[PDB]
Design a binder for this molecule. Structure first.
Ligand SMILES: CNCc1ccc(N2CCCCC2)cc1
Ligand SMILES: CNCc1ccc(N2CCCCC2)cc1
Ligand SMILES: CNCc1ccc(N2CCCCC2)cc1
Ligand SMILES: CNCc1ccc(N2CCCCC2)cc1
Lengths: 187, 187
């Protein structure tokens, strides 16, 4: 399938260079198609990135939904790990998709919708923990959930991209889980 | 002074539109100078932004240094508030400077150097709290400090920019302080 070959080529090329340094000819060439055939499937390379990002985000969303449908520290660690493993398996798409937020309304909306959904879920679990007496009623659950999920987005991204500063990738899950558990269950 | 007029004009224009939508003629016109006179002071509008960002970051750094040279929850709240009030007083420069990270090595290095400095300081205070028995020895202090400061960067930025999702600006200091205090002092 030619559309899949375009997507595979784009992800492969994003490992080596940013989207600005990839041409439609590069994408068409790697996919084994002509430039006009490429434009049948996508109007631009930015549309290719949007489709790649949608597939990665959808993969994380489906894994989280699978977890949601089935100790306290391990509960949170298993969910945070979905983000760690899913986006960490597509670091080039993740990095390019984060950068495209500044210039693409569709990319920004894709990220925003996903984040709002799992912030709302986080808040609902915190509320449930408070209802059963396991967690104290401290901050508004939705505000706490927002900050913790923004921390995870920024901190996981830093670890993936090798940024300075960053938590080493091999330490970042423990670091985030500690902060989540102490801030959710601590007085 | 013509350089200051350029900087003032750029900050004023960044409140209304991004840097891509501001021309050197716009900057020169607002500053009351010609285009070639502008290029005496700055080689590009991106250099103007870099200078603006350097002034804002330096303002925060000097305020933090003043605090460092002079209860536990209030100690952390007063320091986090430096970031809240300094960058919140220059939201347009802050937003443009964050966006320029993706394309400017000098902007990225400016942010990185500042962040590394106050992560190192945060870690040193955490270590001091552990040395005097006030905080438990849980995560490596530098890793904990890294995640907490990345949370603050991402979460304050979201609140300033009106992003969705975000913590409301009037709630964001309480939210961050809670997470810092529980994760630093909690077992
Ligand atoms: C039964 N709840 C399973 C579960 C499902 C999802 C999560 N996460 C926690 C990390 C943020 C997304 C939601 C945590 C636990
Ligand atoms: C509620 N949203 C939680 C969330 C947490 C982390 C992320 N990211 C996405 C960017 C790469 C790091 C993981 C995205 C969403
Ligand atoms: C005596 N220590 C004062 C003090 C100075 C700086 C801070 N911050 C805390 C927020 C991150 C930057 C460092 C906290 C407390
Ligand atoms: C250790 N660095 C801490 C830090 C915390 C917050 C920020 N930001 C800068 C972007 C706007 C929100 C505040 C920058 C640095």
């Amino acid at each position: 399938d030619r559309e899949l070959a375009i997507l595979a080529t784009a992800e492969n090329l994003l490992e080596d260079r940013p989207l600005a340094d990839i041409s439609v000819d590069d994408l068409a060439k790697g996919a084994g198609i002509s430039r006009p055939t490429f434009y049948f499937y996508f109007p631009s390379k930015e549309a290719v990135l949007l489709t790649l990002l949608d597939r990665v985000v959808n993969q994380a969303d489906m894994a989280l939904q699978t977890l949601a449908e089935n100790d306290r520290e391990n509960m949170w660690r298993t969910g945070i790990n979905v983000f760690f493993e899913t986006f960490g398996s597509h670091k080039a798409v993740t990095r390019a998709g984060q950068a495209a937020r500044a210039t693409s309304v569709e990319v920004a909306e894709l990220w925003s919708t996903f984040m709002q959904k799992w912030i709302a879920y986080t808040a609902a679990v915190i509320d449930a923990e408070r209802d059963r007496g396991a967690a104290p009623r401290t901050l508004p659950a939705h505000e706490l959930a927002t900050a913790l999920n923004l921390m995870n987005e920024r901190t996981l991204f830093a670890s993936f991209a090798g940024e300075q500063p960053s938590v080493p990738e091999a330490r970042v899950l423990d670091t985030l889980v500690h902060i989540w558990v102490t801030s959710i269950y601590g007085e």
